[PDB]
C-alpha cells in the first residue's frame, strides 16, 4: 500500500482520455492534460509526458508516473499554505497521505478550511481530530472516502485501505 493506491481507491484509476467535469482532457488518477478543446492537443501532451505513442491509452504505470508528479504539485501547495504547513510538517508518511488526499479531493483551500482538525492533527490528537471531521459535511457528503480517511488519521496504518 501507497498512496498512489490509497488514491487508485478513493478517486479511481481511468485508463484512457476522457473529459472531465468542465471538459478538460484528463487521464489516470485527475491528471489533467489540457485546458484547450483539442484531443490531438491532449493526445500530444500525453505521448510528451509518457515518453511514447500513448494513442490516448495508458498503462497503471505511466499513471504512477504522472500521478507521482500531480502529488508533488499538491504538497507543494501544502506547504505554500501557512495553515497546511505546519500540520504537513507534523504528520508521517501516512497521515500525510491522508492530508493529500483530502488537499486532492476539495483543493488547499478546503482542506484549509479546517481550523481545530489541523490544529489537534498538529498536536497529535489524531483521535480526536478524526472524531471532529467526522462530524462535518464532507464526513456526510462522500462518507466512504472520509471513514478511511478518517481512519488512516486515527490508525496512521493503512489497515482502511487492505
Ligand atoms: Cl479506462
Ligand atoms: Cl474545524
Given at each position: 500500500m501507497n498512496i498512489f493506491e490509497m488514491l487508485r481507491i478513493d478517486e479511481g484509476l481511468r485508463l484512457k482520455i476522457y473529459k472531465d467535469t468542465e471538459g478538460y482532457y484528463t487521464?489516470?488518477?485527475?491528471?489533467?492534460?489540457?485546458?484547450?478543446?483539442?484531443?490531438?492537443?491532449?493526445?500530444?501532451?500525453?505521448?510528451?509526458?509518457?515518453?511514447?505513442?500513448?494513442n490516448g491509452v495508458i498503462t497503471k504505470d505511466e499513471a504512477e508516473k504522472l500521478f507521482n508528479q500531480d502529488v508533488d504539485a499538491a504538497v507543494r501547495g501544502i506547504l505554500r499554505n501557512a495553515k497546511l504547513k505546519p500540520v504537513y510538517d507534523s504528520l508521517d508518511a501516512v497521515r500525510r497521505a491522508a492530508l493529500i488526499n483530502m488537499v486532492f479531493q476539495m483543493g488547499e483551500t478546503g482542506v484549509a478550511g479546517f481550523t481545530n482538525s489541523l490544529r489537534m492533527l498538529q498536536q497529535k490528537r489524531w483521535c480526536e481530530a478524526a472524531?471532529?471531521?467526522?462530524?462535518?459535511?464532507?464526513?456526510?457528503?462522500?462518507?466512504?472516502?472520509?471513514?478511511?480517511?478518517?481512519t488512516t488519521f486515527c490508525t496512521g496504518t493503512w489497515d482502511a485501505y487492505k
Open positions: 487521464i489516470g488518477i485527475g491528471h489533467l492534460l489540457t485546458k484547450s478543446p483539442s484531443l490531438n492537443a491532449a493526445k500530444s501532451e500525453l505521448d510528451k509526458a509518457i515518453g511514447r505513442n500513448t472524531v471532529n471531521l467526522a462530524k462535518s459535511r464532507w464526513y456526510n457528503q462522500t462518507p466512504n472516502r472520509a471513514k478511511r480517511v478518517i
